[PDB]
């Protein structure tokens with residue numbers, strides 16, 4: 001992209017390298033939400049995604065992660081404070097690879113996010129879409145296979161490294 | 167011989183549905199939050215001299231996915247409707263569960279127990295009388311519980327079985 005930043009996650013399975021997933025962040029249309037994810041991926045504010053876990057993976061739906069404060073699926077925080085408002089609903093959950101914010105209801109974005117592995121249109125207007133997988137969808141499909149119907153993973157899937165490319 | 171009962175635990179986020187179920191099944195409490203998607207458990211017990219196989223469906227507090235929630239209610243024979251005594255909104259949600267259960271099951275008489283959980287906490291916002299009055303208006307039992315101390319846990323589940331048996335006598 002000439003405009004949108006690219007970030008990467010190096011994914012690990014029980015500490016072993018699985019592969020790299022890169023993401024285009026739609027700063028052109030969702031700038032505040034894209035900037036939060038970018039800065040959490042570089043760690044430039046002193047905290048962020050490196051070391052955190054994809055704690056909820058449900059095959060056919062999504063891979064969810066990003067709780068680096070409580071490490072139990074209830075936490076996370078943004079670069080703007082603990083939570084920030086839903087920026088816009090311009091983009092929709094149109095298929096595999098969509099990157100969108102997890103939340104606990106309206107205006108509760110922090111750091112948790114999910115990567116869709118299917119179209120999840122029922123989430124439109126309730127979760128802010130802000131990016132998409134650029135390279136490494138095969139790695140996301142590999143992560144998806146470690147999930148289960150209740151979201152518990154059979155091995156621990158972590159972000160071993162992350163940062164900004166280009 | 168024995169009988170089997172399909173029990174479904176419902177109620178708002180964080181009220182203690184899973185903590186109550188884990189106390190019943192595993193006899194322990196850990197003060198950690200692990201938000202549920204869906205889990206099922208089985209336990210053989212004797213209630214009023216009659217051996218029972220309990221099937222327990224531990225649901226998530228969320229209220230999207232109405233097709234799945236409808237199916238939970240169709241399959242379930244009795245419902246533990248849980249609120250937390252320190253969460254007034256969770257108590258205000260209770261009537262919605264009773265309305266949905268009655269609609270899905272096409273009945274004004276569905277086995278249910280009202281459970282006020284977290285009674286060990288010093289931060290009460292829902293008075294016991296308020297919950298007793300609501301339960302009386304429904305004609306259903308009300309039991310205060312603590313998954314932390316185990317107070318009332320067995321009683322809540324066993325009372326629900328008793329309510330199912332009473333309904334089946336009709």
Ligand SMILES: CCn1c(-c2cccnc2[C@H](C)OC)c2c3cc(ccc31)-c1cc(O)cc(c1)C[C@H](NC(=O)[C@H](C1CCCC1)N(C)C(=O)CN(C)C(=O)[C@@H](C)N)C(=O)N1CCC[C@H](N1)C(=O)OCC(C)(C)C2
Pocket residue numbers: 056058061062064073074075076101102103104105108110112114123127149150179201202203204226227228231234235
């Ligand atoms: C009916 C069976 N069930 C099916 C289903 C339906 C149809 C068919 N089959 C099934 C399954 C395969 O059958 C078993 C889905 C589903 C989802 C939940 C529960 C049961 C479900 C669910 C449970 C949660 O605890 C939270 C969420 C969903 C939303 C989730 N937020 C969180 O995790 C947040 C944290 C993020 C930052 C803030 C803290 N927390 C913990 C909460 O919000 C807690 N809550 C709920 C509250 O606070 C409310 C009450 N105020 C979130 O943003 N995402 C991103 C988008 C996906 C979603 N998760 C998720 O997992 O969808 C799974 C799936 C798509 C499979 C839907």
Ligand SMILES: Nc1nc2c(ncn2[C@@H]2O[C@H](COP(=O)(O)OP(=O)(O)NP(=O)(O)O)[C@@H](O)[C@H]2O)c(=O)[nH]1
Pocket residue numbers: 177178179180181182183184185186196197198199200201202203225226227228283284285286287311312313314315
């Ligand atoms: N003090 C106290 N804490 C409790 C009690 N029951 C549950 N908790 C705590 O409250 C939190 C939420 O409990 P949990 O059982 O997971 O709630 P839930 O209703 O299953 N939530 P969900 O709908 O997301 O699955 C946890 O921290 C748990 O330890 C109780 O009786 N007393």
Ligand SMILES: [Cl-]
Pocket residue numbers: 230
């Ligand atoms: Cl959801």
Ligand SMILES: [Mg+2]
Pocket residue numbers: 183184185200201202224225226
């Ligand atoms: Mg639970």
